[PDB]
Design a protein around this ligand. Sequence first.
Ligand SMILES: Nc1nc2c(ncn2[C@@H]2O[C@H](COP(=O)(O)OP(=O)(O)OP(=O)(O)O)[C@@H](O)[C@H]2O)c(=O)[nH]1
Ligand SMILES: Nc1nc2c(ncn2[C@@H]2O[C@H](COP(=O)(O)OP(=O)(O)O)[C@@H](O)[C@H]2O)c(=O)[nH]1
Ligand SMILES: [Mg+2]
Ligand code: NA
Ligand code: NA
Ligand code: NA
Ligand code: NA
Ligand code: NA
Ligand code: NA
Lengths: 291, 249
Amino acid sequence: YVGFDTITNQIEHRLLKKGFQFNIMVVGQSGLGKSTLINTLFASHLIDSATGDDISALPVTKTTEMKISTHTLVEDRVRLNINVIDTPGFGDFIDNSKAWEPIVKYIKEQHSQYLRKELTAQRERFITDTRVHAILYFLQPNGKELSRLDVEALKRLTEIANVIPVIGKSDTLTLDERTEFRELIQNEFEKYNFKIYPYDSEELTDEELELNRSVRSIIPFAVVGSENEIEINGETFRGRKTRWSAINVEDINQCDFVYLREFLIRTHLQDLIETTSYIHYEGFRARQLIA
Amino acid sequence: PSFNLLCVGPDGIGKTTLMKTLFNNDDIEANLVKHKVKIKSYESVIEENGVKLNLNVIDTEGFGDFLNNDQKSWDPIIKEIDSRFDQYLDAENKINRHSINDKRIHACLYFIEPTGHYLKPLDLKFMQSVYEKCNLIPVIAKSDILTDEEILSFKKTIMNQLIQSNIELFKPPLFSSLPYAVIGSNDIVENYSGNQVRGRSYPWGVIEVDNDNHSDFNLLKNLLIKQFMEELKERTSKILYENYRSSKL
Ligand SMILES: Nc1nc2c(ncn2[C@@H]2O[C@H](COP(=O)(O)OP(=O)(O)OP(=O)(O)O)[C@@H](O)[C@H]2O)c(=O)[nH]1
Ligand SMILES: Nc1nc2c(ncn2[C@@H]2O[C@H](COP(=O)(O)OP(=O)(O)O)[C@@H](O)[C@H]2O)c(=O)[nH]1
Ligand SMILES: [Mg+2]
Ligand code: NA
Ligand code: NA
Ligand code: NA
Ligand code: NA
Ligand code: NA
Ligand code: NA
């Protein structure tokens, strides 16, 4: 016994003291449960609604603005530095013809900032990575085909970042309306030929591609979010309770929140971060260098 | 026995389902008579209050679904309202008036998305341009997704916005519960007691249209059909139409 199988222990111990960066962006019109979903995924109140109940809180410039907050969460020994990027003003104005332009600018600006450091003669050992690793795109649960705004926004965002479509407030739909709407949006994705996360790589195994197939079949996720715990017949769980309904957020037989959490965080979290590097950042860097 | 109803809301908000639910008849859209919003006019015969009801439902296609939803986009809505005023004014001035086809719009249901936050600038801009020509009735569409508290907080925010924009809602001579939190379903479902009811069935529960504990649907039904349909037509005739005609001269 030599002992070089210990090398994975040496690496994990080196990365644990380092920490981990995750930069996630939520895109959608106000009132789609975006801040609630972020606060439900990470089981902590990280952000407020970018506008709240105050319409005067909308960006005065009448365009989309970036609202970046920074956070840190610990589980056992893994520290996760989280950047949350909300987009107050997207689709909330009378004129939304430039609703995506500040978003595309922010995404490219982070790559530009990173590449500016990779080219210095005296590079730092640990470059601060503020590149957008994931985009949760919130679609309204209205059973309609993609609006012009969604087509324009997605046709650009899906080319520069890992875009994860999500049906916001999906409890609007019955299970049959959920099947018909999800099948309609998937046909919209084929019609416009968008690159929707996850991607299939040649490095993936037959079981990894199969996992990608099964998760891909329920995208966009039908999510229901809640930071508040409710009680039903003594059992306490987090969800929503009304005059006629009681939704268990962590019930896979009711919504796809649990599937989204396993996907975004437990199986494809590192894949999301690295794909931002070797796909999106490298694609950006290649275009800058040739010009 | 004529009645003309206007439905302004984004596509997929539930306008058609609420029309079938209110009048309890699926043939509301069986008869379509013939960047800008399209106007769709439907004429149906309804057996409401024993007599035949000559219902005319005016609908919108593509409201709020352009990149730029300025007044030029939704102006066909106002052009149609003023046109129905114009047609009545000319036919009213003729020597032989006796069976005028009164196409004047008697009520305008504005559908608010259940965001739970506030009214958008487009919501305020349109309603600021309609309340002086139609009896404006704002509703919160698909309100089943809102908790009991969200509905109260949302209504409080919406009313303060309409008040600050000097927007005037229809006041029954009911008014305090505006905007109405409504649900829509002319379909039969089975509840947890095995009973046939109208509404929508979910894994998380069954909401019932004709249940006063689940929505404000009956309040809107009383305001529109069963209680205050006559005063809705009266305010259009005696006030809204007269103010339009006066400023036209
Ligand atoms: N959650 C919920 N869904 C509803 C309600 N009413 C209707 N829906 C659903 O919302 C979808 C939109 O229904 P429609 O009435 O056809 O939408 P619309 O306003 O007529 O818009 P268009 O279809 O473009 O004409 C349908 O699939 C309905 O099943 C409601 O009260 N609550
Ligand atoms: N029906 C339903 N309502 C939700 C859900 N998530 C949030 N809400 C409600 O929607 C309102 C706005 O949610 P919020 O997260 O602030 O929207 P945001 O503007 O995108 O941040 C809040 O009052 C929430 O209680 C959901 O999954 N389903
Ligand atoms: Mg319709
Ligand atoms: Na505006
Ligand atoms: Na752009
Ligand atoms: Na920027
Ligand atoms: Na357009
Ligand atoms: Na305008
Ligand atoms: Na909504």
